[PDB]
Design a protein around this ligand. Structure first.
Ligand code: HEM
Length: 154
């Protein structure tokens, strides 16, 4: 699928806001995912044991992961669709080391949208949410295609 430039602009304008606090937004997102869809936590051997939201917030390693994930995502969004080189390593580890089904990539997309909507209401009205949704769907479509070539199809 293809985003127009005005859609990419809506995406990169709210992302610029996220980028003022990457660690705080990575924390919010992962916790939202884990609270909404607890089964997802089972994929993380390093964080599997965290029992409450308070322990998740206090986890220094979970914060460092959140930074790593948002940074990789940010790098993809900034390519505005031309993200074939960035997607390759990401799809290989998520398909063959981590084994993350597309369904879980849908769950984290929903958590990203939930946190931007709560934190950036002024820069995340309906049009901007529509554009971010389209960018994450494009992401998911391209990753699923890569999964299939890799032998996983998730
Ligand atoms: C926006 C979508 C996502 C992005 C950009 C992303 C990015 C990354 C990156 C950059 C790393 C470290 C390098 C690597 O192992 O490839 C990582 C690790 C990992 N990811 Fe993802 N990921 C995403 C979605 C998810 C989801 C939905 C799951 C599970 C429900 C997941 C599970 C994991 C696990 C288990 C690891 C290893 C973490 C650790 O170091 O202990 N990922 N991810």
């Amino acid at each position: 699928m293809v985003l127009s430039e005005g859609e990419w602009q809506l995406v990169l304008h709210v992302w610029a806001k996220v980028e003022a606090d990457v660690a705080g937004h990575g924390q919010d997102i992962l916790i939202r995912l884990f609270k909404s869809h607890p089964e997802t936590l089972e994929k993380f051997d390093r964080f599997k044991h965290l029992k409450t939201e308070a322990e998740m917030k206090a986890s220094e390693d979970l914060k460092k992961l959140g930074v790593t994930v948002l940074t990789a995502l940010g790098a993809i969004l900034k390519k505005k669709g031309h993200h074939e080189a960035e997607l390759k390593p990401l799809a290989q580890s998520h398909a063959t080391k981590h084994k993350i089904p597309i369904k879980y990539l849908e769950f984290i997309s929903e958590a990203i949208i939930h946190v931007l909507h709560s934190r950036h209401p002024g820069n995340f009205g309906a049009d901007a949410q529509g554009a971010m949704n389209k960018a994450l769907e494009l992401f998911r479509k391209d990753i699923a295609a890569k999964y299939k070539e890799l032998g996983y199809q998730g």
